[PDB]
């Protein structure tokens, strides 16, 4: 009882003004990601615990 | 001696009388921004003494003032800026409750969108289930009795027939007219679907 | 008539620079990874 | 149920995205991410990268 | 300028007893949804910002520390440890 | 109040004359300190028995005391000298390396 | 749009007060002032900080429960 | 839903009436208001050292055509103070302390 | 520096500390050569310029310096018992999760967290809501957990001195092996002479505190 | 890049448009107060 719509880009054929607006917002975005991955991985990989023994336990 | 006093006085006499001045300039932009996020442009654009204004309101509306110091016309006009004050929280208060009501029509309208959203393969629902149907109704309800309270302000009655009854007339073009749907949509479906060309 | 608008724009600039560095630690590295690839001295 | 219709490799959404995506996205990570990493890395190796091994690492029993 | 008439007219004469009822449902709905969006991002923002700080840095959460020196009690097998509160210095660089 | 704090207080005459001493007992005395390092480098050594090691340690101290002492006249001029400059210094390797070649 | 970064300080918030220009005057007076009690306390800390072990600075250790810390050999 | 969807209906009206009650409370409400003021004045009236000079000239301050160059001078003033006193109190130090290291 | 595996200890008299030199030589290479990857970071920090180093160095260099101090100790220390964590508990509770938290000892998933996430999956289910959104609620309280579980630097400081106390009594304890046989005949009679079982160095300070006080001179 | 990130956010996360203005301004003051509050840390 929903009224059923297509997606207006999966039936429409690339076109290249949407292809270049699509790839300007691609590199800003991942410029954008590019610097937030590079500072989560820094916070990530330097939040390890230190190495341990061959069988400690505590 | 009495330069607490004084101090006070003067302080709320002067920010009344500035938000008295700038309050119909305030109003009209409030007017003209749409119900939901009716404080829009604003905190964007210009606050124009807007939450200024408000918090100098609320203290009027719950502080008192000593008009010994202030002669006859300044007391005259500093009950002028707090009956403007007063009027201009009424208004406000009266945008927050068309706010909240565009704002329930709208997360209606973004739960139907929800479930037939290309992207939604979470859950898809080809047919409404009865508390979205019967909240609608609620909810077309409501509109049409607030519509009919607008009636002795045709501007205002327009406006919200033209902010809110936009949200319902997606809803409605959102579902189909089978079943039960008249049922939903027999108030809507009078005078008001018309004016969305429906 | 914005005055200073040189020193806004300076201001907005450094410190968008600033919280880069100091968020991310662009400038402070780590040479760990390649410390087993060198050649130790003495 | 979603008889999802899309007509492939001729969209939008499909091989064209797949091969525009990687060239697009990469440019800022690959247009200075590369040369700022090659300047911060060579900036500590002034005279060289090797390691004044200290504590010794010489000595075997 | 502008021609605000209708504006002007809506705001100078408005309804002081209009009010529509609230539903429940939606409006708890809707902020739920708000918080949703404010709790992760928000949070993750705000621990990140935090955290890296006190993760770059623990000296500076850690002001003061003890150090402990042991020594033996041969006759009753036990271990008699002495202490000293110090401060939390970046040793050896 | 995050750097070590300061134990024994040499002069800076004092700090540059054992620096110079240090760089030359390196270049002078290392297979006494790595003598040293190796024999206190087990945890018997390092803790248990500490007069396992005692040997070793007084070799690399006598050592030390002898490249710090500066007996031979050219030592001790290079080693003035070296000085005089790290005190302009309030460059200099050039004096370093030939204090060191003595 | 397509391009919306820019070095313009916002328009909303670059306003001005009705005395004047923005309080920053006084605000960065109070912010040194501030900072000269702060970072006067960290430099007096820092250089005025010596190490000395004399056998006294050493005190015998208790646990939370307060009575002797002491270990048995075999635990 | 089931008989269930009565729990969830009951689980809203009663969140939204908590929500009521907290934001209505006079004294709660009187002191969200006031956070409200405080965070508008510190939010829209930052400090900024850029701002709107409409006026003209001619009535404009001399305070805000110096305040860039005051609070620039200010700040620097500031840090080389610091960096002179650190260095002063550190030189001090160093021969108080030698002097009582005798 | 490196030091051979195979240890001299008699291993038949003194077995505590026989043992300690074989852990000890066990864990001595990939703690030195993690040590060295340090150093060697530190270094080149060091020969870093302007903002890049040589000017925030030292004091932006703190997690580097916590990490030696902690690798070095961790070298010190062969292997940790479990047994003696818990006597550190008498001094210090939850030494055994800042040693798990630091030392990566065992796998440590959010098991409060993912319990909490299990919870909000039982109100999905009850208001019925999307799968989707359950999970995401399900990670949320797991994702707090792990968030707050990580990046605990002063539980490093904890593990610290925890690990300066467990090589302090180490020391102590591995000294009175050695002259055990020596004191034997010493602690026979000295436990039929005096019934105590606190330490003479504690009762040494009260007699020559009360010869102090109360004697005739 | 925070009013671009509202806007893209507004734009393909159809959930992010469930919050009003009103959230988003506080959202917007509270990341503000958040970076001045770490720009002021990293440097004391």
Known sequence: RTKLYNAAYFLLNNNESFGHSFGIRLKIVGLNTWIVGYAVSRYYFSSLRVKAAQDERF | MSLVSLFKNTFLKSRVIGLSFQAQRVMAQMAKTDFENPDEHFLLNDAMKYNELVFYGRLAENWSINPELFGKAELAKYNEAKQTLIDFNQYHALVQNLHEFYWELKTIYLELSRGVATSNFHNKREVTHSIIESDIKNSIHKYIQLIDDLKDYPEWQHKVREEIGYYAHMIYTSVNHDGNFPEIFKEFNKVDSLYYFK | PIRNIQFARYHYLAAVTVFTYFATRCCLLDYKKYYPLASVKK | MRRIFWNFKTAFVGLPMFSLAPKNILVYPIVVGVPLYTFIVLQNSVRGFAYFDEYDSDVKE | ?93 | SILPPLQYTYSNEESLELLIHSIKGNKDCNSERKAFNLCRSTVLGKHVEPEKCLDKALVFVNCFQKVRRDESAACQSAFNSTLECGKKYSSCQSQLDAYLNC | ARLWWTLDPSKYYLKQISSGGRNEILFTVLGVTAAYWYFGNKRCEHYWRRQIDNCQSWSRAQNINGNNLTVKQYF | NHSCQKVFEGFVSALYDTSYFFRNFGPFKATIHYATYANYLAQNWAPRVSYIETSTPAYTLAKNKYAVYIVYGLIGGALIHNYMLDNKAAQKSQQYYLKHRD | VRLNLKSNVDQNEYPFLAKWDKDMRQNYEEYQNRIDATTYHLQRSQRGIAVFGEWMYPRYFQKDILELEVLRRKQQLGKIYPEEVSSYTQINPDIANDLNLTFNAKLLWPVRGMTVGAGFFAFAHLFNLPYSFRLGLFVLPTAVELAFTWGNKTSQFKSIEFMDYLLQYRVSKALLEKNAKHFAEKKAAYQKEINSSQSVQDLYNQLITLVSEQAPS | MFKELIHIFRTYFITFRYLKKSNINFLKNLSYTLIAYYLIINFM
């Open chain 5, 1 to 93: 300028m502008l021609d605000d008439t209708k504006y002007i007219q809506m705001a100078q004469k408005f309804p002081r007893n209009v009010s529509v009822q609230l539903n429940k449902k939606l409006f708890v709905t809707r902020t739920w949804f708000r918080n949703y969006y404010f709790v992760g991002v928000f949070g993750i923002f705000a621990y990140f910002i935090y955290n890296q700080p006190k993760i770059f840095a623990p000296f500076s959460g850690y002001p003061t520390t003890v150090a402990y020196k042991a020594q033996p009690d041969f006759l009753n097998d036990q271990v008699i440890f002495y202490s000293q509160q110090r401060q939390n210095t970046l040793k050896n660089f």
